[PDB]
């Protein structure tokens, strides 16, 4: 049905994602077991360091295009992530490596991420049909990749540790590169301009030597946050001021106004979320005991089942619209769940929390694969440059709004915990709701603005 | 999933006993353990247990006399049972919950010792 380079970039994009989440998934449960952090700690970490890994993004796809290739950078970025893995391994023996292994992670993630894509959409002619159907398959093995790790990397950590864990996510990065190497073959013709050309060992250089830099720089960020959220605050500050001095941008920054609400809230799955489901939800489902984390695996599991559907199934300002009002449902049903269907003990069904990841994932389909795609027929390379930026911001923001479910190591009563998930969660789900009016307030003007 | 309690037996009023609960694949460290005990007659009822990273809790009746504490190297959560009285005969259940949370009824609890009879005599 599709190319024989379609099946490749499907693989390695499998493999890649599924490290990638292995580590998502047990990283702040990690820095609160493993290393100690109390949850206000781990949750604002895990903030900064998903800012880093879809801050850096733009990077790796300048570098794809214009300095190193694109099959190259996928190899490079593929190595620059598995070294990471494989650090993140030996950080249990060695504690002052964590940052840097999650520096690797992020930079190693930034120039990697954005080339499959590009690969792919060199597979086809420019108008075969087909190209929406791979797109869409190329979403969903990504999901796969997530739906296998969130699953299995923590009855894995719990059963033989975060050494084992990381190694596996390691050996994936590895599998990617081997599959990838062993069908370099089928990619022939395949590539950007740099990669036909001689490759350039000066330029080659140059990247080395930024990602190391930056691998330092991603390291001190994350032990620091207090000046990573002053980082961020200048730069968005100040790319906003040099947006607001230079029709169809502004419904752009618009648009990009609302992604940053919509990211805020996909920050909460690894963590308070995490935690919620950790704390205040029954460990059981189908008569089958489970391991809490694995409950994040729910996100990517609807968006496999209902990409497929929901491609088979307005256009842009509804499409957002729709998205932030499935999300504020979301943190509504959360909330709703907590206040009213509680045991005597104040633990609450899991039925409930999976129809709070349904709420969550479709409102994903909905803003997530249009935005990003679709901001780029509203336009250029500076707000792509903003676009990182302001998700990264959302990703920092989104750590510090989880530290509002925070619980100290010492309280044990379901009870004095459930109050305090279900009042930022229905504060949350109630700000989007009001939210998403205003888009909704805002829809034919955009419209209008669009045409 | 899997704990084997141990520690037993027939006390003398104002004695001793100290009960233990390991794990075979899992490791306890990332798991609250309450112990519950169950007497002639009566439902399984929460006596004690400690969370994954220290905190405590207890029923209000043993304050004072039982100790709950936890050996991270040899993978162990141990009871300490001290001025027994002979109310506390009964069935003695360890039980194992991932996390930081100690729910007071046993279906909170996924995982499951055997039981151990403690007998205290007058």
């Known amino acids: 049905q599709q190319p024989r380079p379609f099946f490749m970039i499907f693989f390695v994009e499998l493999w890649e994602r599924f490290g990638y989440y292995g580590v998502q998934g047990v990283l702040a449960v990690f820095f609160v077991k493993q290393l100690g952090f109390s949850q206000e700690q781990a949750f604002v970490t895990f903030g900064a360091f998903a800012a880093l890994v879809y801050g850096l993004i733009s990077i790796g796809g300048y570098v794809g295009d214009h300095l190193l290739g694109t099959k190259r950078t996928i190899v490079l970025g593929a190595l620059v992530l598995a070294i990471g893995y494989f650090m993140t391994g030996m950080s249990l023996l060695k504690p002052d490596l964590i940052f840097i292994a999650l520096g690797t992670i992020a930079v190693g993630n930034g120039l990697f991420k954005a080339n499959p894509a590009s690969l792919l959409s060199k597979c086809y002619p420019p108008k075969d049909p087909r190209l929406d159907g791979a797109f869409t398959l190329f979403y969903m093995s990504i999901n796969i990749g997530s739906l296998i790790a969130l699953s299995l990397a923590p009855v894995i950590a719990d059963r033989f540790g975060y050494s084992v864990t990381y190694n596996l996510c390691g050996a994936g990065l590895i599998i990617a590169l081997l599959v990838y190497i062993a069908c370099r073959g089928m990619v022939k013709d395949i590539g950007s301009e740099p990669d036909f050309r001689p490759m350039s060992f000066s330029k080659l250089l140059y990247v080395l030597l930024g990602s190391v830099v930056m691998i330092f720089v991603c390291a001190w960020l994350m032990h620091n946050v207090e000046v990573a959220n002053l980082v961020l605050i200048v730069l968005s500050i100040v790319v906003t001021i040099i947006f607001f001095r230079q029709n169809k941008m502004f419904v752009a920054f618009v648009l990009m106004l609302e992604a940053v609400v919509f990211y805020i809230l996909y920050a909460q799955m690894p963590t308070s979320l995490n935690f919620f489901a950790i704390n205040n939800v029954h460990h059981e489902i189908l008569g089958f005991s489970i391991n809490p984390v694995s409950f994040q695996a729910l996100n990517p599991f609807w968006v496999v089942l209902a990409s497929p559907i929901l491609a088979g199934i307005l256009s842009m300002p509804m499409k957002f619209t729709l998205g932030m009002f499935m999300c504020s449902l979301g943190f509504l049903t959360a909330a709703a769940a907590g206040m009213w269907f509680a045991d005597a003990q104040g633990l609450t069904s899991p039925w409930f929390i999976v129809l709070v990841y349904l709420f969550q994932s479709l409102g994903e389909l909905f803003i997530s694969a249009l935005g990003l795609a679709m901001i780029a027929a509203l336009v250029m390379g500076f707000i792509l440059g903003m676009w990182f930026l302001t998700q990264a911001a959302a990703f920092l923001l989104g750590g510090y709004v989880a530290t509002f479910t925070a619980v100290p190591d010492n309280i044990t009563d379901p009870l004095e915990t459930l109050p305090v998930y279900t009042n930022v969660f229905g504060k949350i789900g109630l700000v989007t709701l009001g939210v998403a009016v205003v888009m909704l307030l805002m829809v034919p003007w955009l419209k209008r603005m669009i045409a | 999933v899997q704990l084997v309690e141990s520690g037993g037996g027939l006390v003398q009023a104002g004695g001793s006993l100290r009960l233990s609960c390991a794990a075979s694949?899992?490791?306890?460290?990332?798991?609250?353990v309450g112990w519950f005990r169950q007497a002639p007659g009566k439902e399984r009822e929460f006596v004690a247990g400690?969370?994954?990273?220290?905190?405590?809790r207890y029923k209000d009746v043993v304050k004072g006399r039982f100790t709950v504490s936890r050996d991270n190297v040899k993978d162990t959560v141990y009871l300490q049972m001290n001025s027994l009285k002979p109310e506390d005969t009964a069935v003695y259940y360890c039980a194992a919950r991932f996390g930081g949370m100690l729910p007071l009824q046993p279906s909170g609890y996924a995982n499951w010792g055997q039981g151990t009879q403690v007998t205290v005599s007058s």
């Open positions: 400690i969370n994954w990273s220290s905190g405590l």
């Open positions: 694949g899992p490791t306890l460290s990332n798991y609250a």
